[PDB]
Design a protein around this ligand. Structure first.
Ligand SMILES: [Cu+]
Ligand SMILES: [Zn+2]
Length: 134
């Protein structure tokens, strides 16, 4: 039984960097580790990937969720539309920023990610192709 994404409220702080999450724009992230039933919330897809690619945690991470920017506006992502990050399309290197500056756009629809790149630049990636280089 997969653990489910949860709403992010105004008091939630990023698991990596401690900043308040919902003040800032850009897709946010959540994930669970095998060891804890409490979801870990992140201020940005940037910090989500930084955490889950860290060798200390890479094997502990099970469920990973990101806002679907096919459905939610960039400035105010909506917690009703979390998608499975492992099946999403990602845009790295666009001009659009999140809570930590540069960030990773996340979409359910490949053509939406491609149109995003047409507008704002960047490159298209699947979950597995995102490494510590990016
Ligand atoms: Cu931050
Ligand atoms: Zn953060």
């Amino acid at each position: 039984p997969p653990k489910q994404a949860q709403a992010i409220d105004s008091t939630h702080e990023c698991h990596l960097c401690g900043m308040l999450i919902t003040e800032f724009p850009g897709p946010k992230g959540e994930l669970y580790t095998k060891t804890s039933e409490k979801v870990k919330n992140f201020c940005s897809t940037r910090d989500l990937f930084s955490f889950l690619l860290d060798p200390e945690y890479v094997h502990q991470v099970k469920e990973v969720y990101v806002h679907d920017m096919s459905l939610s506006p960039w400035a105010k992502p909506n917690d009703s539309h979390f998608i499975n990050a492992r099946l999403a399309w990602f845009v790295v290197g666009s001009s659009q920023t999140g809570a930590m500056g540069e960030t990773i756009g996340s979409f359910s629809v490949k053509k939406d990610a491609e149109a995003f790149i047409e507008q704002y630049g960047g490159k298209l990636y699947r979950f597995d192709e995102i490494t510590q280089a990016q």
